[PDB]
Amino acid sequence: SRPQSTLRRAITAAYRRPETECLPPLVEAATQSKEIRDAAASTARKLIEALRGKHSGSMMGEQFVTGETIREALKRSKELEEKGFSYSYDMLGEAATTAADAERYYRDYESAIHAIGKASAGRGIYEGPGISIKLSALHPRYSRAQAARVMGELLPRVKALALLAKNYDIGLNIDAEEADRLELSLDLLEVLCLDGDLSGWNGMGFVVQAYGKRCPFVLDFIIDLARRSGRRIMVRLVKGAYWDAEIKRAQLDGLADFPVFTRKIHTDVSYIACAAKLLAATDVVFPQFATHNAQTLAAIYHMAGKDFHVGKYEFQCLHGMGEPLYEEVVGRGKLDRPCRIYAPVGTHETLLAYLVRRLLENGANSSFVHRINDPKVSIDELIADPVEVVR
Amino acid sequence: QSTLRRAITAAYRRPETECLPPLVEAATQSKEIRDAAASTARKLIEALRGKHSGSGSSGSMMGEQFVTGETIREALKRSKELEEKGFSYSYDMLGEAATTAADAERYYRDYESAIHAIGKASAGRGIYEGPGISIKLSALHPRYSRAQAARVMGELLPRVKALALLAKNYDIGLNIDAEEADRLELSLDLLEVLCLDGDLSGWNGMGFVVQAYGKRCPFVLDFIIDLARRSGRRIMVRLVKGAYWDAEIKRAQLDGLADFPVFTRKIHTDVSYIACAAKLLAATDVVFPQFATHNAQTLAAIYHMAGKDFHVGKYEFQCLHGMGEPLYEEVVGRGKLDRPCRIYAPVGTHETLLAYLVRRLLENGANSSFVHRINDPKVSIDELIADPVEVVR
Numbered sequence A: 001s002r003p004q005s006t007l008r009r010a011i012t013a014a015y016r017r018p019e020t021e022c023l024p025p026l027v028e029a030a031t032q033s034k035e036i037r038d039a040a041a042s043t044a045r046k047l048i049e050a051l052r053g054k055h056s057g058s059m060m061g062e063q064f065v066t067g068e069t070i071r072e073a074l075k076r077s078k079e080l081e082e083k084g085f086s087y088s089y090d091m092l093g094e095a096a097t098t099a100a101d102a103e104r105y106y107r108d109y110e111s112a113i114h115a116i117g118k119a120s121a122g123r124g125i126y127e128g129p130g131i132s133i134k135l136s137a138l139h140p141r142y143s144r145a146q147a148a149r150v151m152g153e154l155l156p157r158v159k160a161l162a163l164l165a166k167n168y169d170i171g172l173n174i175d176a177e178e179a180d181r182l183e184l185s186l187d188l189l190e191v192l193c194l195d196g197d198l199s200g201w202n203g204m205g206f207v208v209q210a211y212g213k214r215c216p217f218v219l220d221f222i223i224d225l226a227r228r229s230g231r232r233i234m235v236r237l238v239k240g241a242y243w244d245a246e247i248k249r250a251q252l253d254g255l256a257d258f259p260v261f262t263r264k265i266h267t268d269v270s271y272i273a274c275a276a277k278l279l280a281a282t283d284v285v286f287p288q289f290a291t292h293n294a295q296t297l298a299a300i301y302h303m304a305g306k307d308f309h310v311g312k313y314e315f316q317c318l319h320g321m322g323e324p325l326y327e328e329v330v331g332r333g334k335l336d337r338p339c340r341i342y343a344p345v346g347t348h349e350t351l352l353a354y355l356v357r358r359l360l361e362n363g364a365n366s367s368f369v370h371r372i373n374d375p376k377v378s379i380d381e382l383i384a385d386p387v388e389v390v391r
Numbered sequence B: 001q002s003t004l005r006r007a008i009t010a011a012y013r014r015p016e017t018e019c020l021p022p023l024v025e026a027a028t029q030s031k032e033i034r035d036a037a038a039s040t041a042r043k044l045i046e047a048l049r050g051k052h053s054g055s056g057s058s059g060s061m062m063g064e065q066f067v068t069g070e071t072i073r074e075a076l077k078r079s080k081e082l083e084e085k086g087f088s089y090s091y092d093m094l095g096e097a098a099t100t101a102a103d104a105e106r107y108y109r110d111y112e113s114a115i116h117a118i119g120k121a122s123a124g125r126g127i128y129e130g131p132g133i134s135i136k137l138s139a140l141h142p143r144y145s146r147a148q149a150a151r152v153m154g155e156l157l158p159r160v161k162a163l164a165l166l167a168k169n170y171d172i173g174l175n176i177d178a179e180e181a182d183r184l185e186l187s188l189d190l191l192e193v194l195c196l197d198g199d200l201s202g203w204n205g206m207g208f209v210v211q212a213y214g215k216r217c218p219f220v221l222d223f224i225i226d227l228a229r230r231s232g233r234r235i236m237v238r239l240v241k242g243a244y245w246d247a248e249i250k251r252a253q254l255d256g257l258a259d260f261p262v263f264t265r266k267i268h269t270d271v272s273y274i275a276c277a278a279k280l281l282a283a284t285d286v287v288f289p290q291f292a293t294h295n296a297q298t299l300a301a302i303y304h305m306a307g308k309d310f311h312v313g314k315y316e317f318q319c320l321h322g323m324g325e326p327l328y329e330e331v332v333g334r335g336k337l338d339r340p341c342r343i344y345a346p347v348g349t350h351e352t353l354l355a356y357l358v359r360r361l362l363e364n365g366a367n368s369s370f371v372h373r374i375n376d377p378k379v380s381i382d383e384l385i386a387d388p389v390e391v392v393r
């Protein structure tokens, strides 16, 4: 059969599979024992009470950017690195419209890797800083051009950045963008992981969005790719940043079934099911659990069990959103688990698209970060396991 | 179809370089007016920079700064303080782009109940001294942007007419907000039908927004001024720059168009606004101009362009709740410029607030926005009082 026929067919079949059909296997995989659920509720309660206790109970988003340049961002990272946080730097900029813009973004990433690699100073991919890139920044027609043209021009660029990251032994993560570019980005991940020029480096990383119906099947493909390539792929599990745009796009596409879930707790169930899959594959992937939701965090912390070492998995958060929560996580007296801060770098000329996504995240009534400040939402509701709502 | 309607259609994607010469000419003020406006603008900006207005005051992503109240009852109670200072209100029941019939029905009921509450609170103060309402057509039809324009207008007309009839019963203003460029024509057709509908005779509260970032703006205004004159309706015309610029650019880039329906340089929108303000100020007999802006230079220019004669009902300024108060506290009142300002006042929950908040973020966060520049240490007062006609190059 075609290479990985079964795994690839499962991804395509899930693309727009009816939401009601996607959920039952996720619910089962996300169901944890009463004893674990009780312990997780206690941890989530503590995290929420501590969050408010230490923070007395901005739209312009200056708090979301770590620096205007990589040199400035690296200087401002020393304090939290001393405490046990790590960083992933994001040179802001996406959706290049011209070939010249794509070349400028490439050069920004290239210079950033040199600076980050020098700052890392041999700390390696888990304890030291890394970089995150967006494929839409590196091809001028990313959303519109045929995959053959995008691949043939994007692959040499991404390979070159990955080689530089290998040379400094830092992480290089491909951020996940709109649903219609998942397939191309995954094909690119495969080619890079099988490229012998990158052998010996486990810093290649890839995001999977749990609001997407394909998420568990993409994870199956990635875990199998790790096994056959010999690369321990860093896998950032997120819920997803483009929900409002995906809903609008699917409506304008005339779709009867969308590529993302439309009930928020379904995304939560999907995230926990996929975390269970990742936690069973830590021999071949490095799970990175990106979330600001204290209930999600506590559920994964207890799911992962008592055995931990740095390099087994980590949590992640966004700069300007997650530090209060993760100050109750990192460190021996807390949960003794590491957290990597995603750290945007740039100016107003490149901040807009990201800030809009942060407003849609922070301003939505369904978001944990909004509900924690909502007087109508009890602590009981914040710590409730969403899997029990649909079980 | 008419010569005036044809001028609108022909301008839709007219090349930007062709649109500008007539706007530059119309936006050119005499030296005496320019000097007076520079003096007024400098005074306003010096006062603003003694305050802490602009984008830095936008508050948190909870959006608390931008919503007047959760219900119309709450919002009406909170309006008494600023009403006696010389402000009026236009209440906006938040909600837009209905996707289902149930949503469009809920938004209709929200608007209807707001009109009853606002009209009762107005207590016969009329359309200028008393509060009004603003509506979005996309809230009232479940496929506003995705269905054929003719059929959309036909189902929308009875609903908007029913709301207009309630507004007439209480003698309050009812304004149709302007949304995306591809729906200007439909909304303008609806306005014309309403203004020729004898059931609405004797009421001057029908209002309509025109966006100066659009290439059709002056020709829309010519059509509306003529419609007011021939129908006997003193149409309330809210002149804005526009709230959807980033989305219009993105759609136009995807549509593969060489020529967009909006200007692409901020200074061109500024020139367009001043040119269109000149057109409106020449037509105060038949339309009620409402100059919506937070830009102190724009305001000062219009204040001097309007001349010395003023009475309530001639024209007004407008601002958004949570953005315009620092500026307009230097405008309303007998100790200031003695001109009225109507506050656009969103009313709703956090849920219905999100889309409006995104447009406020794009407005407040853009380096090109007056409200961002007023707080920017790199931007001089000299730059803030520059006349757009004298800068454009």
Ligand SMILES: Cc1cc2nc3c(=O)[nH]c(=O)nc-3n(C[C@H](O)[C@H](O)[C@H](O)COP(=O)(O)OP(=O)(O)OC[C@H]3O[C@@H](n4cnc5c(N)ncnc54)[C@H](O)[C@@H]3O)c2cc1C
Binding pocket: A174, A175, A176, A177, A207, A209, A211, A236, A238, A239, A240, A241, A242, A243, A261, A262, A263, A264, A265, A266, A267, A290, A291, A292, A293, A296, A316, A317, A318, A340, A341, A342, A361, A366, A367, A368, A369
């Ligand atoms: C370090 C880091 C890196 C990230 N990288 C990426 C990336 O590369 N690509 C990407 O797309 N996202 C990425 N994200 C995720 C995104 O930016 C949000 O931070 C994240 O989705 C919020 O989830 P949460 O668990 O913190 O919050 P929660 O409040 O628990 O979850 C909110 C999320 O639920 C989802 N949602 C909301 N409403 C609905 C609904 N009606 N139906 C279904 N789902 C709904 C959305 O995904 C929303 O963001 C990243 C996040 C972090 C912290």
Ligand SMILES: Cc1cc2nc3c(=O)[nH]c(=O)nc-3n(C[C@H](O)[C@H](O)[C@H](O)COP(=O)(O)OP(=O)(O)OC[C@H]3O[C@@H](n4cnc5c(N)ncnc54)[C@H](O)[C@@H]3O)c2cc1C
Binding pocket: B176, B177, B178, B179, B209, B211, B213, B238, B240, B241, B242, B243, B244, B245, B263, B264, B265, B266, B267, B268, B269, B292, B293, B294, B295, B298, B318, B319, B320, B342, B343, B344, B363, B368, B369, B370, B371
């Ligand atoms: C009471 C009130 C009601 C309003 N109602 C509506 C409405 O119904 N519909 C609507 O669309 N808008 C409406 N607006 C306008 C919108 O919400 C903004 O408030 C307004 O455009 C900002 O203009 P300004 O003069 O305050 O600021 P300025 O800083 O002087 O102008 C900013 C504006 O310039 C324009 N712009 C920015 N960059 C560019 C560029 N590169 N090229 C071209 N133009 C550019 C945009 O329109 C932007 O909002 C309303 C505004 C107010 C105050």
Ligand SMILES: C#CCSCC(=O)O
Binding pocket: A175, A176, A241, A318, A342, A354, A357, A358
């Ligand atoms: C968060 C993150 C990384 S990708 C989506 C975004 O930039 O918002």
Ligand SMILES: C#CCSCC(=O)O
Binding pocket: B177, B178, B243, B320, B344, B356, B359, B360
């Ligand atoms: C402002 C205003 C009225 S219409 C556009 C928007 O709601 O942002």
